[PDB]
Structure formats: C-alpha cells, structure tokens
Write a protein that binds this ligand. Structure first.
Ligand code: HEM
Ligand code: HEM
Ligand code: HEM
Ligand code: HEM
Ligand SMILES: O=P(O)(O)O[C@H]1[C@H](OP(=O)(O)O)[C@@H](OP(=O)(O)O)[C@H](OP(=O)(O)O)[C@@H](OP(=O)(O)O)[C@H]1OP(=O)(O)O
Lengths: 146, 141, 141, 146
C-alpha cells in the first residue's frame, strides 16, 4: 500500500502502543454488537444476545486477539499484505465462507477502537493512514476469493 | 419512494416477465455468482454448477417473492415481513449483497425485455429493487 | 430502526458533545477529507486547508443539523425535509458519501467521549447516523 | 485489469459489435435518468427534465459518444488502464470535480445497456468479464484523485 513513509511511520508508532489483547477483543466485540449479522459466523462462542454478553464472551475475546495478532504481523509486510494474507485469504474463502465485506466492517470498527483508545493522538492524518491500512488488509484478505 | 408511474412501469415489465420469472431469477443468481463471486460465500451448501437445480429452485423462490412484492406494491413492508425476518435473523446476508443481486436482476430483465426495458422502466425497476432490498434489510439491527 | 434505547443512547452521547459539537463537526469533516479524498469533489469552492474557516463554518452547520435530528429523533423526516430537499435537488451528493462522513463522525466521537463511547452507544450512533443518512437521501429519485 | 485471456477475447469480441456512438448516448442518457443526481454535472446541457428530454438531448448524445469513445480506447489497453486514463483521471478530479462513484454507476448502466442490446448474447460469463472491465476502468479513472 501506497503508504507514504510519514504514513508508514505513523502507523508503526501508534501500533507499538497497542495492547493487542484488549484492542483485539474490543474490535471483535464491537463488530458483533454494531453489525449484528456478523454474529452468523460465531454461533459456537455462545451467548451474544447482549453487548455485555458479547464484550464479556471469552472466546469473542480470544478470537479478537488472534485476529489482531494476524493483523499485527501483516503490519510487518505492509509492502506485501497480499502474499502475507494469501493463505488466510483462501481459508476465509474456502473453509470459513466469510463475506469479505466483513473485513471492511472490522477495519472501520478497528479505527473506531483506536481513536477510542488513543483519543487525541489518533489524529486525522493518523486515521487517514490507518484507513489505508485497514482497506489494504481487507483487500489482501479478499484477494483469494473465487 | 415509488411513484404511480414507477408502479405502472414495474407492473408492466413484471407482467411481461410473466411465466419466465423463475428462469430469470435463476439466471440473475448465476450472473451474480459469476460476476460477484463473494456472494457465493452465502451458498456454500449449493451445487453452484451451471444448470444446478438448487439454483433453478432458488431462482423461482426469489422470482416468486418479487412477484409477490409487485402484487403488493402498495404494502411491501408487510407483503415481505416474513422474508425480512428471515434475512435479518437467520441468513444475515450483508446488505451490500442486495445491490449485487438487484443489478444482476436488472441485467437479466434488460437481456430478456428489450422492448420494455426503456430508460423510464429501467429507472422504475432499479427504484423497485432498491425498495425491496431496503424492506429485506430493514430488521437487521 | 431506532429503538428506545438507541434514542436514549444518542441523546446521551450527543448530550456530552454539547458546546463542542461545531468542533467535532469540523473535525469529522477534516478526517473525511483526509481519509476519503474523493469527498473533496463536493467542496471545490472550499478552502480545505487545515483549520480552514469554511471547514469550521460547515462543521458547525452539520453539527447543528445533527443536534436537531437528535432533538427530533422521533420525526426526522420532518425535522430534516429542508435538508433532504437540499441534498436531493441541489447538492446531489452521491449517497455513498454519507457512510464516509458518518464513519468520520463516529471516529470523532470515540476519540473525544471515550467513557461514553460504549459498544452499545457506538451501535446506537451508527444506526442514528445511518437513518439520518437515509432521510437525507430519501428524495433523490 | 487482470482478465483471463479468455475474458478479454470475450470482451473484445462483443465490443466488436458495438455502435459506440449510439451505445454511448444510451448509457449516458440512462445514467442521468436512473441516477438523476448525476445531472449535477450537466446543467449547461439544457433540458434533462424527462426521460425523452434526456435521451434525445443532442448534448447528452454528443457527450455519451466522447465518453464511450474514450472507454473504447481503454479496451485496446487493458494491460494499462491506469496509464491509459491518467490524464482523464486528473481532469475529472482537478477540473470537473466528478466523484468517482459516478464512474462505477456508469459502468453498471453500461452493463445493462450491453445486455439490452445483445440480449442472449450477453451471457453470464460475458457479463462477469465486462463487470471486471468497468470496475478496472472506474479504478483507473479514480486513480489520480487526491
Ligand atoms: C479483518 C482481519 C482478519 C484477520 C487478520 C483474520 C485472521 C484470522 C485468523 C488469524 C484466524 C485463525 C485461522 C485459524 O488459525 O484457523 C481466523 C479465523 C476465523 N475468522 Fe478471521 N480474520 C479477520 C477478520 C474476520 C472477520 C471480520 C470475520 C467475521 C465477522 C472472521 C471470521 C473468522 C472465523 C469465523 C474464523 C474461525 C474461528 C474458529 O476457528 O472458530 N474473520 N481469522
Ligand atoms: C431482493 C432480493 C432477494 C429476494 C426476493 C430474496 C428472497 C429469498 C427467498 C424467497 C428465499 C427462500 C426463503 C424460503 O425458504 O422460503 C431466500 C433464501 C435465501 N437467500 Fe434471499 N433474497 C434476496 C436477496 C439475497 C441476497 C443478495 C443473498 C446473498 C447474496 C441472499 C441469500 C439467501 C440464502 C443463502 C438463502 C437461503 C437459501 C437456502 O439455503 O435455500 N438473498 N431469499
Ligand atoms: C451526516 C449527514 C449530513 C448532514 C447533517 C449534512 C448537513 C448539511 C448542512 C446543515 C448543510 C448546510 C445547508 C445550508 O446552507 O443551510 C449542508 C450542505 C452541504 N453538504 Fe451536507 N450534510 C451531510 C452529509 C453530506 C455529505 C456526506 C456531503 C459530501 C461529501 C455533503 C455535502 C454538502 C455540501 C457540498 C454542502 C454545501 C456546502 C456549501 O457549499 O456551503 N453533505 N449539509
Ligand atoms: C467510463 C467513464 C468515462 C470516461 C472514459 C469519460 C471520458 C470523458 C472525456 C473524453 C471527456 C472530455 C474531456 C475534455 O473535455 O477534455 C469527459 C468530460 C466530462 N466528463 Fe467524463 N468520462 C467518463 C465518465 C463520466 C461520468 C460518469 C461523469 C458524470 C456523471 C462525467 C462527467 C464529465 C463531465 C462533466 C465532462 C465535461 C463536459 C463538458 O462540459 O464539456 N464523466 N469525460
Ligand atoms: O494501490 P493501487 O495503485 O490503487 O493499485 C493496487 C494494485 O497495485 P499493488 O499490487 O502494487 O498494490 C493493483 O494495481 P495495478 O498494478 O493493476 O495498477 C491492483 O491489484 P490487483 O493486481 O489485485 O488487481 C489494484 O488496483 P485496481 O483494483 O484499481 O485494479 C490495487 O490493489 P488493492 O486494491 O488490493 O490495494
């Protein structure tokens, strides 16, 4: 991605301050809460009936950190999200049947979680760079769909 | 909102569709699967091969539902509430997908009703499908 | 479809914005222009520069229409007809842009009302901006 | 635009049959009739008050022909949409201020127009190839926006 270096530097720096555990559970929980139809893939997590039920859910929370974990590595390969997510791309496609529109929804949730977290520091320009990242990630993850 | 003209346009084009509705439904779905392959993530359980009976069977179902919305053009929220419930709560199809099928249905009709598919009818039809899609996703959250 | 909780949720959130609403409006615009540069095609006559007086001016107007929608949660269509008219017949902003500005306002709120920007509140504001978007684009065709 | 070769012959084969002049006036007039907010760019074109005012409007027809002619030339450079359209990209951005979403609408209208014209001949796989082409052209046109 057409991340500019001041852009790439901007991403990297905030990212470094991220508690993946927490940001990953928060991101996945908020997705399930704001866009309830995304719950369709997580029936097995249990109870998602309420925002508290969702936010509290340990596996939502454990799947949130694993998803952010994977995201976090892609940030090492910004250069190449595509080859960095190819296998995850096929997986999401061939085994999980996840519509890639979900990746977009998670991306935007993530940006809201980061602003929430970093307030002040998650400036328009830093948001612009992350927007480009989350869009890049969604595209690399959707790339192997067929 | 559907104007009187829109409604006239839609009853007219749908009238001509007539007996072919199912076959157009099944073609609209194939078009969709082929042009927007991500829509296939919702039919992992279907035989999505050309001439798949699951597809032919699903096309009629979709075509019947649209025929029913046309039949109740003045009460679609209610005519389709069961299908809104279905899609809101069980299927949980992401909303963007409705635009993709709408578009493939418009293409299908264009491909089959050249004399009817005038600019004004095309305008009415798009507004209709957008209305049906809005109805189907109205209970999502 | 704004539930009772939603409305209470937005009234709350909106409630804490209070005199910073014009500020958050201008910030939300700024974020949109930087994150989604295509949105700038609607403001060629604006000085889109950082902390531009037009951008602040506009931020306030938009922030004031949201406040009004919040006050009239119950009667948006009405509360905002002038504004749907305006956008439908004169501005003619493409409807995809409403999603971008709504996102930028959610991001603006979260960044500033962290306590209050709860998973539930967040869900409520998203639905809220979505229906405002809907109202504003209802008369397009 | 990464099209199978099988996808570009298909594209190329059909295209071979289009009357650009006429299809360009039809796709542009339909755009303005079906998505009337797109009339915002053509105030100077006169009367677009009704479907016949739009469709038979000689400036709509004349513009339709230049738009499709430009599209038509992109079809010869599938391999390099983005270069092919760069100066048009910048013009639409910097001078005309066209939101690129308009390019996507026109691409969809265009697909409906080819279907209207070719009927049966516009098969599902021919449509899938044109879907990629018009998406490729909208992306090339949106490429230099900033
Ligand atoms: C946005 C960036 C995403 C990344 C980097 C990502 C990454 C991952 C990873 C690393 C796994 C574990 C794969 C495995 O080891 O089996 C996984 C599994 C999974 N993901 Fe994604 N994912 C993303 C988004 C999403 C979204 C938005 C959804 C649906 C709302 C989703 C649905 C799933 C499901 C249902 C599984 C299987 C969970 C299980 O095994 O129970 N993913 N994902
Ligand atoms: C306005 C457009 C649509 C109409 C009228 C429609 C109508 C229907 C109908 C009548 C059914 C069968 C429910 C029953 O068993 O009675 C159904 C099921 C279903 N629909 Fe929709 N639908 C539409 C849009 C979509 C879209 C865009 C998608 C995904 C891309 C989708 C995915 C599904 C799936 C996966 C099922 C169940 C199929 C099965 O397991 O048999 N629908 N729809
Ligand atoms: C959240 C939804 C929105 C709201 C509440 C809103 C509200 C408003 C308000 C209050 C005005 C000033 C009207 C007056 O002069 O009295 C306005 C004008 C305007 N809006 Fe919207 N708007 C929204 C979305 C958008 C979007 C998404 C765009 C485009 C990216 C847009 C573009 C414009 C433009 C170009 C003007 C005219 C500005 C000028 O030339 O001064 N609006 N809107
Ligand atoms: C396939 C996509 C398109 C292509 C290849 C295309 C190509 C062209 C060309 C060759 C010109 C003349 C350039 C010049 O004057 O130097 C032009 C002008 C223009 N285009 Fe596009 N265009 C496309 C889509 C659109 C759309 C969808 C709109 C808005 C709905 C639009 C709005 C305009 C306007 C307003 C002009 C200037 C007309 C005038 O006053 O002379 N274009 N375009
Ligand atoms: O970032 P952009 O300049 O907008 O273009 C990138 C990508 O380039 P990279 O692989 O170098 O990031 C490709 O553009 P071209 O090389 O064809 O110009 C193309 O990706 P595909 O090869 O998968 O098509 C796609 O642009 P578009 O969709 O406009 O064709 C887009 O990739 P992303 O959207 O995944 O960033």
């Amino acid at each position: 991605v057409h991340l500019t270096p001041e852009e790439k530097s901007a991403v990297t720096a905030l990212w470094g301050k991220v508690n993946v555990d927490e940001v990953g559970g928060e991101a996945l929980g908020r997705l399930l809460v704001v866009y309830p139809w995304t719950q369709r893939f997580f029936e097995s997590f249990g109870d998602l009936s309420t925002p508290d039920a969702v936010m509290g859910n340990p596996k939502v929370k454990a799947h949130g950190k694993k998803v952010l974990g994977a995201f976090s590595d892609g940030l090492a390969h910004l250069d190449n999200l595509k080859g960095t997510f190819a296998t995850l791309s096929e997986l999401h496609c061939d085994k999980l049947h996840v519509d890639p529109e979900n990746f977009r929804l998670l991306g935007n949730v993530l940006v809201c979680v980061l602003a929430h977290h970093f307030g002040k520091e998650f400036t328009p320009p830093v948001q612009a760079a992350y927007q480009k990242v989350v869009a890049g990630v969604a595209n690399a993850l959707a790339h192997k769909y067929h | 909102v559907l104007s009187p003209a829109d409604k006239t346009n839609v009853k007219a084009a749908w009238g001509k569709v007539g007996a072919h509705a199912g076959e157009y439904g099944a073609e609209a779905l194939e078009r969709m699967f082929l042009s927007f392959p991500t829509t296939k993530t919702y039919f992992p359980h279907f035989d999505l091969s050309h001439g798949s009976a699951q597809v032919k069977g699903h096309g009629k179902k979709v075509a019947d539902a649209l025929t029913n919305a046309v039949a109740h053009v003045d009460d679609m929220p209610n005519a389709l509430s069961a299908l809104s419930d279905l899609h809101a709560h069980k299927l949980r199809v992401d909303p963007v997908n409705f635009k993709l099928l709408s578009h493939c249905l418009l293409v299908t009709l264009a491909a089959h009703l050249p004399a009817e598919f005038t600019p004004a009818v095309h305008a009415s039809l798009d507004k209709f499908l957008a209305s049906v899609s809005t109805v189907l996703t109205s209970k999502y959250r």
